[PDB]
Structure formats: structure tokens, C-alpha cells
Design a protein around this nucleic acid. Structure first.
Ligand SMILES: Nc1ncnc2c1ncn2[C@@H]1O[C@H](COP(=O)(O)OP(=O)(O)O)[C@@H](O)[C@H]1O
Lengths: 97, 442, 96, 109, 85, 96, 80, 109, 96
DNA sequence: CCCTGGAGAATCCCGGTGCCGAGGCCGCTCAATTGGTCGTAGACAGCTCTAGCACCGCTTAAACGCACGTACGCGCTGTCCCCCGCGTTTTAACCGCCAAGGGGATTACTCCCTAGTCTCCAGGCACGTGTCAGATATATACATCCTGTGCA
DNA sequence: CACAGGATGTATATATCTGACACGTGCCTGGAGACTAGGGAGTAATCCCCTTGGCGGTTAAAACGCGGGGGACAGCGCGTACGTGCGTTTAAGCGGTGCTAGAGCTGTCTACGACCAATTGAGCGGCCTCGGCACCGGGATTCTCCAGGGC
């Protein structure tokens, strides 16, 4: 009885919404904690400027977006609609990573 | 006005209350802004209610008024408003976006009220709405929130258009003279617009005498035996010494050396690796690895076979966790009132510790939790495991058990570690406390 | 008075007013434009330096800049930039 | 006497700092000697590239009902143009976003 | 001895966040095993970039990592970033 | 008579050509192709033999790598036959 | 001058594919491979001719070819 | 008088030309000044990389029952090593061939 | 009258006789090794020059060479190369 | 039934040719050796503002958890045609050799261009400061899905 | 199978507000003007080498055709895991204390290491020459694939 959308309308709606914007999709404090955790292994007693973490987040988001676009291309090549770790691995292998 | 007017309901004002009302009325007649430092528990809210009732009744132009209170006191102030002086109408702004919009567009914007009660967060959110209405009187309760200039609340509260202003705070002086200058700048910006015996002390007294009124809680009750204090110097455990030397000389990140020395003089187990291995037992390791813990292990059972009802104040949740482990090991009843304790869990804990026939013994409290409440009269001994820079925080912590409802002697035991940063902290705190005394107690 | 930092912001603003008279630009966009100019300058200068070293010469000249522009820019942009640079060099040589 | 000072940018009819470009070339360790016309050529090329990208970004802002240019407009201008996209293929623009692009198999049908 | 661990930081990159990134990438349906692979590849990318940035910072004899060090590391990787330097 | 199944000769050729290191394109046709392509950029261009050999080496290496990626795409599509769709997908992911 | 791209013959393309490691080849792939080869050669020869013209020579050298390949990101070892 | 000449390569115990590396650094337009230790360090690094590659290539050649090293041996050595492959991941070796591998799905059932 | 060309051929041959005493090398392999040495030299030198520019210094030092090696070479290669270079520098400072 | 026979390809061992790598010489140019200078970088003070540590109160958007149904991924079948293996015929590559000339590579010379200096001064940069464009909120109006209900 | 209508999301105006962009101002430091000195490169001339054009014979390689099996592609069915919406929980974000030092930035002073110059002797590049490794052919083996007891 209650209103409900078909399985895939909200997905395309979100696709359009997030392709219309420019904001950051990851959470700033968790990303900062991850960056500090990674840098601790390389060197201890390291301090980060606020701009460094922002640049890291921008670069990481751009890399992930491009990876997902290539992954979607692979999934469509495989006559599918869902993306898979197979697609991610194929994209990385062809790009040379 | 030597006697309280007839508009007050549900009781008549006291002598100190009516003299404070007269002081406030003289302040307004002179057109000055002032600070009521009558200390917590001496009817500041009742005096302000009486002043507002006077302005509404005896003077025929009661305009828009605003009262700023902590969110923990909004209900109490609204209750006092409704009980004492029902002839005046008051409204409160609290809730999410939809509640706020409904309230403003139904009651506030039409403009039929006379007193608006809001908290700090709602003032910051609704500064646009509260900025429109011309303000006749601005009451700020617990005024030591706006001590720091260039803070957002201070800027916003100085941006309003207020004809008359008033501050209510028990502790006008906290650390320096800059906060007192900020409060006096909010009161009268023209008079105090600079960097605030004969050359000192007395000059400050003469300056602050017209603009201040403080009554120590001694001329009203003539009861509640005075504070008793004992200071205990304690040496550290051997691993505490080893870690102290390690931190002093310079793998673990030890950035704030003073921040490490603090807890290192409390308990080394807070550091990573100072604990024993996989078994993680809780048997006598805690006691022997902290001298303060040794002294507390001596003190607590003796108070228990004596008056018991002890309060332990500490400045770290990790220290509170270690103390909880120790109390579980010793099979003591413990209550942890901390910053993370949900509000409903605090009230029943306080009531149960204050139950007429209780069994609770240890009550662990973070020194800055709650605030301006918590009446633990049944408690006897107050143990300050640490001590912070402000002596005011320690004073309020020690008087949380030293309240009007207390009938027996209360003693405050203060632990300190020799040849460490605790000496510096306590001596600074004493310097600030003596500044407070020599500038205020007169 | 902090240290002086040099940027192409004023020249970018002049070109912007030349192209679109009534338009503006933000701090982030200006920073991006400064970075773009720096990166392009670096690429062109490096390619000209490598050309001079390959041909065993010690001077970077307008010929080297033109060849680097052709090597780095993609086609229509390359030809338009070559025309603009040649025109500017002709104007400079004719003037002084 | 001493003649009036005219900028080399004024001589070449440019809106870019020919003198600063010459100084950067000489301080950048690109070669031991720098020609006279090389900074003029380089300044003209930089000016032309800036003009192209700014024209495209201003067009984007005008069709976006906005007077000021933002990194989103810069990204929209850099993409949708083949030559600029080829030039800046490996460049990430902060707060630029992505072009709207939905594959035809994902469209409802 | 009374301590606890909240969560590993690689789990702070949440499932809805990865979904939003995929939505911007242009993806309709996502398998449930995608999130672990995404976390792994993000960790690899961050480790490489941070190693280069820390190398630059150590060379400059500084204890603070700066945006210029990050952009130099990215340019070394071949991922030039405009907007911070 | 004797006839091999369709695919054993292919595997034999795969093994032998992966073991060998010679060039797989005819040199005179490659040289003619190079000269014809160079006719659009300049006239009367003369070529060293080493230049043509280097061009052939680079072209063969590029095509071999492209075919590896194309085979991977075809296997991802659960096939064994490589297709122009596979080549285009490989080029698109490489960034060409 | 024509028919020389068609001189890049089907057996040669098959040999290249076999060295790549493919088993079955569709019939439409030969034209695609020829087009890809033309694009690659066009780019490389364009850069090499630019280097030659800057050198003010008429002969294209292995050094010019190597420099072009290196500047396109395809460094070649074995010719200088 | 003057002492007999002693090469800096002899002083540092290297088989690569410290003086030639110093001259190449001076003439290569890298910096205005060059220190004394930089040529020695760079010669040591180049010698180490050459020795590693040559050792791998010689092992590969002896696996071929040959005495001389060829480009095929160099390619085998480079592509069979992870770190050398990463270092030379965008390089083409002339007359090198490719690593022999067949995808498992193409093998007969 | 062929002008003198330089190469690392004799030094590569010395290293080869040090590591494999009775193994020879051909001319094509020698050319490949010479090209490899030149490429590595150029990479490290360019990285060190960029480091000097970033830090606003005028001289290239062993510190810059070490940082460039850490940047370019991956992992164990970088560790072993740093060890070898440090040893060579210490020997040069002690011997001189 | 699988396991065996036949046939083709691949492998290993031997003997004769060719040429290319390794060694030995000449000379000339580049690197080592001394000596002298200066400017770059190290070392050191003084200042200042950001960054880190352990908490507290409060708000609210976002994340987590959960149940349901539905497209969708995956497997299995069948068809047919397209691709592969093999024989035959033809075409052009490959090799060897020869002939001619364009052009790359070298050298000598001169001049003209650029580096370096000193004086001068104006364009560019930091600092204040104020007004407008863009963000936000909120009520409308429009376009978009989705399902039911006659059509069966 | 084709519309009606309901519900929802999204575009559209309009009003308010704020903080960043654009502009003016003073100062200073780096670019321009005028000048001189020296060496890099443009220009001409010469040599020889190495590219191009052609011819003839060889044989391997390509093109064409043919026949048949296996792989691609469409179709169907199933049962499963992911989208969707709702209710509950958590921590991200903001605003505060509270000290200290800490780390980076600028100005000054001073020594030592790198440039530069002249001089000279071995190290290294080019040129010959020669023999052993690779190559090429030949002939005797072992492996593997295909057809059949449906051998
Ligand atoms: N009308 C009154 N007369 C005397 N004492 C009072 C009165 N009202 C409150 N108090 C005392 O004040 C204490 C609480 O102080 P506070 O909350 O400041 O009061 P208020 O809210 O009235 O200002 C109580 O313990 C109570 O004893």
C-alpha cells in the first residue's frame, strides 16, 4: 500500500545528484585519522597541515571516481549491470597498477 | 525599597534578597550595568525575578527582555517564573528546526510576550530573529562563559541592541584580569576600554565597588561548618619514576610533555606497554604501581570503618576507569558520574547516592562534569586525586558535598606528587586563588 | 609585511577583462589558473632545454620555444599559439 | 637625457610579464643563455592559452546564470573541449566534479 | 588494565561513502564485496603518496607535512593537482 | 588422413612465437607505410635504416601489449575470441 | 601511394596476436589493428619530423625516433 | 714537487667514472654548484644497478646454455624481477621478446 | 675523421667481469646497458635538481642524491643503493 | 570402458663455417694537482602563531540495522555459422650487387648577440575596506513514476 | 495493454544576509636604459658516406579455396542478493578550557667548500687483428595428439 519506487530509479536519481555537485563524499575526520595512521608507520611524531589532508582527500576521491568509471565500463562489457571485484581487478590490470 | 512588593507569590523575599533588589534598582536608576556575585545557592534567580517583576509592575513600559541561561537551567528558570511571579509572561526557545520555526512564527514574531528565555546554542542559531527585537534588558546567567573575547558567543552578545544589561556569575575572576575586563567591557564598554596599598589591590577594589555586589554564604545561614583541608605529598612508584625519566629525556608519540607528565604522576598503566602481558589480571598491580593508589588504598578503608561517604574527583576518564577496576577488586560500591553518562542515568545515581538509607560508598566524579548542581550532602570526605589550574573548579567540586543540606564535618584530601609538575600546578592554582581572594572577598 | 609571493593573478585578471568584460573570478579559480600557467611554463621550458641539449647548443631561442610549442600542444592550439608568438616577436623586433 | 621606461610587454603588445618570464627562464637552470625573443614568444603562448580557457569558462558561467567563475566552470570548460582535455588529461582540478555521463544500458527501458 | 579499541580506521571509510563515490562514477548496482577491494586500493594509493610526501618533508628537515609536499608527491606519481600550489 | 583439432596449432604457434624474438612484419611493406605516412608532414624526407628499424620495434611492442590487454578483456567477457569491442575497451581504459 | 597499409597483412597481424597470447581471432579485428597502427605511427612520425626540422636536417635519425618515443612515454633501449 | 695522479674512482673503490659523472653533472644544467660527494654517490648507485641487472642476466644466459648475454637474456632478467620490472615498467628492450605465458582458460580441457 | 664518442662500455665490462668472471656480452646488449645507465642518470639528476629548486638551494649534494634515490627506486633496491652510496662516500672522505 | 597404435612435432647429440667479440697499440684530450677567493650555507638568536592532548556540553545529520520483494546474475540447451587447419598457386620479399649523388659532418672566421654593471624609478604586492553576488530558506508550480482499472 | 490520478521530487521566484572580491594606497625592489666585452653561432666551403634507385634470381610467404567442428549468441528458468524504505544509534561537527612549549620564519655573522685558472700525464677511444662461440645442417631419440573396444 505505501508508495514505493522500482529498484533502480533512486539509483539513477542519486547518480544525477552526485554528478551535479562538487562536494567531498568522504568524512573529513575519519579520513584524517586514516592519513595519520598510515603516516605513523612511515615516521613517528609527524604533524599534518590541514591543507595537506584536504589535498590527499581530493586526490583520493578523484582516483576512486576514475577507477569506478572504468569498473563500470568493464561490467557493461561483461553484459552485466552490477560492478564486481573482478571488474576492479581488470581495470587495475589494464591501467597498469 | 526596604520591603519586597506584593506581586511576589509563593513566599516573601528574604532580607538579603530585598537588599540585592535595592542594589539592582539603584544600579538601574543610575543607568549602570552590574554583576551579581551572590554565589550559587543564594537566590540569584529569585532576585532577578524580583527585578523583572518590579520593572513590569511599578514602571509602565515593560518591553522585550531576554534571559540567557544554560540548557540545564531552562526548566528551573521557567518554573521559578511561573511560580513566583505569574503576572509576567515568559516564553522559551528550544527544539529542532520545526519546533523553533513554529515557536517563533506563532508566539515570538507576533510580539505579545515580555520575557524570552533562550540557551546559548539557540541564541547562536536564532541570532537573526533575536537581533531584530529591540532589547530592554539582557540577563546572562553563569556569565563566566563569555570571558574570552573574540569568541562567537561574546561577539554575538555584544552585537545586540540592549538598553540595559546585567551579569550573574559566582566567580567573576577565574585566571587573570583579562576576563574581568571582558565582563566589565560587556557591562559598560565606554568606561572600560583598555587594559584593566594604593597602586594595586585597593585601586581595583575602588573601581569594582560601584559595579559589583557579592555576599559570601556566611551571613545568611550561620551553619554548615567551614571547609577542612589536608594535603598529602606522595612519592611515585618505581616504574612511575622510570617513565618520568623517559619522558623527561625526550617508540611512542609523546607530544605534549606536560600532558604526559600529568597522568604519569597518576598512573603509568595509561601508557601503552607499561601493563603486564596477556593475563591482564587486576590483583594488586594497580595498588603498587601508583603511590597515590597506595595512599588511597590506605585511606578509603579507614574512612569506611569511619564515616565513609567519600567523593573522589579526578580529571581523566582513564584514571576513573583504573579507579573503577580497583573498586571492583576491593568489592566497593562505586558510581561513575562522567561526561559520557547519559542524563537520565545521572539523576537516579545522584538520588540513590543521596537515599536516606543507602549503601553506596565510592562516587567517582570528573571535576568539570554536570555543573552548578549535584547536592551530595550525605557525602563526608572529598578526595581530589588531581588538581586543575583553576582553583574555582576545585572549589566548586569540594563544595558539591559542602552544601546547605550538609550537617557534619567534611574534609578535603588533596594528593600531590613531590618534585614533579603537580607542585607547579598547585602553586599556580594557589596564586590564582589568592588573586581571587585579595580582589574579591572584601 | 610578510615575504612577497609572486603570482600571475593580475595578468589573468587583465586577460579575463579583455575576454569577458563583465565577469569575475574566485580565489580557488585564480589559484587553479596560476597552477595551470606554472605547469605549462615548466613543460615548455623543459622541452626547449632538452631540444637545446640534443642539438648541442647553449641558448634557448624563439625557434626552440616554437618547436617545444609544436611538440607539447595538440594541433589547432599549436598552430594558433605559433601564429600568436610569431606575431608578438615581429611586433617586438619592429618596435625595439 | 634618460629616455622614458617602456615595458617589453608594452613593446610586444602583451598583458603578461616578459621581464618576469625572462628572469624565471634565467633562474630555472634551463640553459646558460636565453634569447631576447624567447620570453616574448613564451609570454604570448601563455596569454593565448589563458585566453582560450577563460573564454570557455566564462561561456560556462554565463550559461550557468552566474557572473563569477568557479572551479566547476573551469572543469566544465577543460572537459567538453578535445584539445584542452588532451592537454590536461592527467590533471586533477580541486572542487571540479565530473561531467554528467550515464551509460545507455543503465537508462530505463 | 581497562581499555578498549573502537574501530580500525580503514573501516571509517563507510559503505554509504563508497556508494556515493560509485554514484559519482556512474554506477547503478554494486556488489557487496566491492567495499573491501575499494578500501584496499585506497590504502595502497594513500601509502604511496604519503611515503613520497614524508620523503620530501624529511629532506626539507621539517616535522610538518605540507600541501606543497603532497602536490610534489602527486606530480611525481603523475597525478598533477591544481588548486593547492 | 591426419588433421589436428581446431586450436592445437594455435597453441603451438603461441609457444614458438613467445619463445622467439624476431620481427613479425615485413620490412619493405613497413618501410613503405612509414614513408607514405611521412609524406603528409614533409616532402623529400630521407630515412636512416636504424630509424625504420626502431619504429618497427616500437610498433610491434605496442601491438603485442595491446593484444595482451585485449585477450584479458575477452576472457573477462567469458569468451576466447578477441573482438574490436575488446580492443576499444582496452584503449579506453589505457587512456587513448 | 596506397595499398601499403594493406601490406600490413593478415598473417603478420596473426603472428603479433599469437605473440600476445590470443587463440581465436575475429575477422573484423584486422582493420581495427591497421587503424591503431596508423594512429601510433602518425603520432611518432609527427614528433620525429618536428625534431628533424628543428635540427635543420632532411634525414630522420634513430635519435629523433628515440627522442619522440621517450617524450610520448615509450622509452626504447637499443638505439642510443 | 707534485704527487702521482690518483683517480677519485680509485679513492672511492668504484668501477665507474667519478670524474666523468662530475663533468656530466656540471654540463647538464642541473644546478649552479655540485658537491664532491654527489658524483661518488651517483657512481656507486649506477654501479649497483648495473651489477644487479648483469647478475640476473648472466644467470638467465646460463639457463640458456649460452656464454654471451643477449637482449633476450636482459629482457628475461628484467621482467622476471618485481623491483627491476617496476623500475623499467615503461621501457621497451629491442630484440627482447615477451615472457612466455598462456592464460589457463585457453589450455585444452 | 670520426669525433670521439663516449660510453660506459668499459665500466659495464669491468662490472660484468667482477660479477660473472667468465661470461661475455654482445654489442646490442652493451648498447642497451649504456642506454639504461644514461636513463637512470637522467632520472636521478633531474629529481635532485627539482629537490634543490623546491628547497631553494643552489648546490646538489649527497643528501639530495640520497633523497632522489629514495624517491625513484622502490623498496629493497633503494635500501641497498643507499647503503652502497653511503659506504662509497665514507671511503672517499676517509681516503682523501 | 580408457589405453594403444600411428604419426607428427619437438629434443638432443655431432660435425663443419663464419664473423663477431676480446685483446693489443697509438695519441690526444680530459681529469688530477696546487693555489686563491668568495659567497653560500651553517649556526644562532628572537618572535609568533599554529598545532597537539585530554575533556565537556549540545545538536543533528548520517550511519547502522532490518525485513521484503524483485530484477538480475548465473547456469543449461540448442543452433548455425564463423573461424581454423590444410593443400595449391601465385606474388612479392629477401639477398646480392652496382652506380650516383644528396647531405651529413667537419673546419675556419667573423660578427653580433648576450652576460654583466650601475643607476633610476615605476609596476607590483601587502594592507585596509566596503558593497554586491551567491548562498539559504520558503512558498508555489511543474514534471516525473507507478499503480490500478477498465480493456480480456 | 493503454490512460487517470495520486504521490513525490524538482524546478522557480523572491526576500535576507554575509563575507569575499574588487579597489584604492603607500612603499620597495626588480625591471628598464645605457654601456662594454668576449665567445657562441651563423656562413661558407670541402669531403666522403650512406641513402636511394635499379636489376636479377630464390624461395619462403601470402592469397584463395574447401570442409567441418566448436564457440558465440539467443532463449528460458531459478533462487539470491541487493535496492528501498523505516526506525534506532552514534559520532561528526561546532563551540568552549587550558597551559605551555614547539616548530617554523627572519635577520646577522662567519668559515669552508666549490669555482676558476694553469699545467701535465695517464685513461680512454679509435683502429687492427685473430680465434672460439654461435649457427647451420644432419640424424637418432622422446613426447604428444588423434582415432578408436564407440580400436
Ligand atoms: N525564597 C527563598 N528563600 C531562601 N532561600 C532560597 C529561596 N529560594 C531558593 N533558596 C535557596 O537557594 C538554593 C538554590 O540556589 P539557586 O538555584 O540560585 O536559587 P534560585 O534559583 O531561587 O536563585 C536552595 O538550596 C535554596 O535553599
Amino acid at each position: 500500500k505505501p508508495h514505493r519506487y522500482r529498484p533502480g530509479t533512486v539509483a539513477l536519481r542519486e547518480i544525477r545528484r552526485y554528478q551535479k555537485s562538487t562536494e567531498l563524499l568522504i568524512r573529513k575526520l575519519p579520513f584524517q585519522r586514516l592519513v595519520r595512521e598510515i603516516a605513523q608507520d612511515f615516521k613517528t611524531d609527524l604533524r599534518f597541515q590541514s591543507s595537506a589532508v584536504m589535498a590527499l582527500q581530493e586526490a583520493s576521491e578523484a582516483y576512486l571516481v576514475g577507477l569506478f568509471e572504468d569498473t563500470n565500463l568493464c561490467a557493461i562489457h561483461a553484459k552485466r549491470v552490477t560492478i564486481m571485484p573482478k571488474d576492479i581487478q581488470l581495470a587495475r590490470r589494464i591501467r597498469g597498477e | 525599597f526596604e520591603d519586597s512588593p506584593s506581586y511576589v507569590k509563593w513566599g516573601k523575599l528574604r532580607d538579603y534578597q530585598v537588599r540585592g533588589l535595592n542594589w539592582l534598582i539603584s544600579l538601574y536608576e543610575n543607568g549602570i550595568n552590574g554583576i551579581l556575585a551572590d554565589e550559587m545557592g543564594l537566590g540569584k534567580t529569585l532576585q532577578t525575578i524580583s527585578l523583572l517583576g518590579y520593572m513590569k509592575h511599578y514602571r509602565n513600559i515593560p518591553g522585550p527582555h531576554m534571559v540567557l541561561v544554560p540548557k540545564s537551567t531552562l526548566h528551573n528558570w521557567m518554573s521559578e517564573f511561573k511560580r513566583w511571579v505569574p503576572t509576567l509572561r515568559s516564553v522559551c526557545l528550544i527544539g529542532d528546526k520545526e519546533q523553533r520555526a513554529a515557536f517563533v512564527r506563532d508566539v515570538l514574531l507576533p510580539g505579545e510576550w515580555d520575557v524570552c528565555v533562550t540557551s546559548y546554542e539557540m541564541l547562536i542559531k536564532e541570532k537573526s530573529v533575536f537581533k531584530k527585537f529591540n532589547w530592554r534588558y539582557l540577563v546572562i546567567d553563569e556569565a563566566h562563559r563569555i570571558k574570552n573575547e573574540k569568541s562567537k558567543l561574546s561577539e554575538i552578545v555584544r552585537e545586540f541592541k540592549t538598553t540595559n544589561r546585567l551579569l550573574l556569575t559566582g566567580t567573576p575572576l577565574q585566571n587573570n584580569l583579562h576576563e574581568l575586563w571582558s565582563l566589565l567591557n560587556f557591562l559598560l564598554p565606554d568606561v572600560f576600554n583598555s587594559a584593566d596599598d594604593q597602586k594595586l589591590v585597593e585601586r581595583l577594589h575602588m573601581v569594582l565597588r560601584p559595579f559589583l555586589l557579592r555576599r559570601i554564604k556566611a551571613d545568611v545561614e550561620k551553619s554548615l561548618p567551614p571547609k577542612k583541608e589536608v594535603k598529602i605529598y606522595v612519592g611515585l612508584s618505581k616504574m612511575q619514576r622510570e617513565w618520568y625519566t623517559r619522558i623527561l629525556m625526550k617508540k611512542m608519540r609523546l607530544l605534549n610533555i606536560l600532558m604526559q607528565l600529568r597522568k604519569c604522576c597518576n598512573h603509568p598503566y595509561l601508557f601503552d606497554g607499561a601493563e603486564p602481558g596477556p593475563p591482564y589480571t587486576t590483583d594488586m598491580h594497580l595498588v603498587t604501581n601508583s603511590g597515590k593508589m597506595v595512599v588511597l588504598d590506605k585511606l578509603l578503608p579507614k574512612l569506611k570503618e569511619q564515616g565513609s561517604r567519600v567523593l573522589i574527583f579526578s580529571q581523566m576518564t582513564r584514571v576513573l576507569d583504573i579507579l573503577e577496576d580497583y573498586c571492583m577488586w576491593r568489592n566497593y560500591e562505586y558510581c561513575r558520574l562522567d561526561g559520557q553518562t547519559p542524563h537520565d542515568e545521572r539523576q537516579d545515581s545522584i538520588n540513590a547516592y543521596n537515599e536516606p538509607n543507602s549503601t553506596k560508598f565510592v562516587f567517582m566524579l570528573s571535576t568539570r562534569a554536570g555543573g552548578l548542581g549535584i547536592n551530595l550532602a550525605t557525602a563526608d570526605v572529598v578526595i581530589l586525586y588531581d588538581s586543575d589550574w583553576n582553583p574555582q573548579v576545585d572549589l566548586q567540586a569540594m563544595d558539591r558535598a559542602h552544601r546547605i543540606g550538609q550537617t557534619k564535618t567534611v574534609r578535603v584530601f588533596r594528593f600531590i606528587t613531590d618534585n614533579t609538575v603537580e607542585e607547579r600546578i598547585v602553586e599556580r592554582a594557589e596564586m590564582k586563588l589568592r588573586l581571587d581572594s585579595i580582589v574579591i572577598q572584601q | 609585511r610578510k615575504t612577497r609571493k609572486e603570482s600571475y593573478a593580475i595578468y589573468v585578471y587583465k586577460v579575463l577583462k579583455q575576454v569577458h568584460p563583465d565577469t569575475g573570478i574566485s580565489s580557488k579559480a585564480m589559484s587553479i589558473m596560476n597552477s595551470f600557467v606554472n605547469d605549462v611554463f615548466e613543460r615548455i621550458a623543459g622541452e626547449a632545454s632538452r631540444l637545446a641539449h640534443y642539438n648541442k647548443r647553449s641558448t634557448i631561442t624563439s625557434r626552440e620555444i616554437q618547436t617545444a610549442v609544436r611538440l607539447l600542444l595538440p594541433g589547432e592550439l599549436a598552430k594558433h599559439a605559433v601564429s600568436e608568438g610569431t606575431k608578438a616577436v615581429t611586433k617586438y623586433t619592429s618596435a625595439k | 637625457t634618460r629616455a622614458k621606461a617602456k615595458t617589453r610587454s608594452s613593446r610586444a603588445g602583451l598583458q603578461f610579464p616578459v621581464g618576469r618570464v625572462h628572469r624565471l627562464l634565467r633562474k630555472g637552470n634551463y640553459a646558460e643563455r636565453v634569447g631576447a625573443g624567447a620570453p616574448v614568444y613564451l609570454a604570448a603562448v601563455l596569454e593565448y592559452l589563458t585566453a582560450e580557457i577563460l573564454e570557455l569558462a566564462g561561456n560556462a558561467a554565463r550559461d550557468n546564470k552566474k557572473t563569477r567563475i568557479i572551479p566547476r566552470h573551469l572543469q566544465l570548460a577543460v572537459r567538453n573541449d578535445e584539445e584542452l582535455n588532451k592537454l590536461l588529461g592527467r590533471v586533477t582540478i580541486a572542487q571540479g566534479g565530473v561531467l554528467p555521463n550515464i551509460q545507455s544500458v543503465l537508462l530505463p527501458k | 588494565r581497562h581499555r578498549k579499541v573502537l574501530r580500525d580506521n580503514i573501516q571509517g571509510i563507510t559503505k554509504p561513502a563508497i556508494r556515493r563515490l560509485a554514484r559519482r562514477g556512474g554506477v547503478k548496482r554494486i556488489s557487496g564485496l566491492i567495499y573491501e577491494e575499494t578500501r584496499g586500493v585506497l590504502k595502497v594509493f594513500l601509502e604511496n603518496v604519503i611515503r613520497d610526501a614524508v620523503t620530501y618533508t624529511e629532506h626539507a628537515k621539517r616535522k610538518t607535512v605540507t600541501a606543497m609536499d603532497v602536490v610534489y608527491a602527486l606530480k611525481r606519481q603523475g597525478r598533477t593537482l591544481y588548486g593547492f600550489g
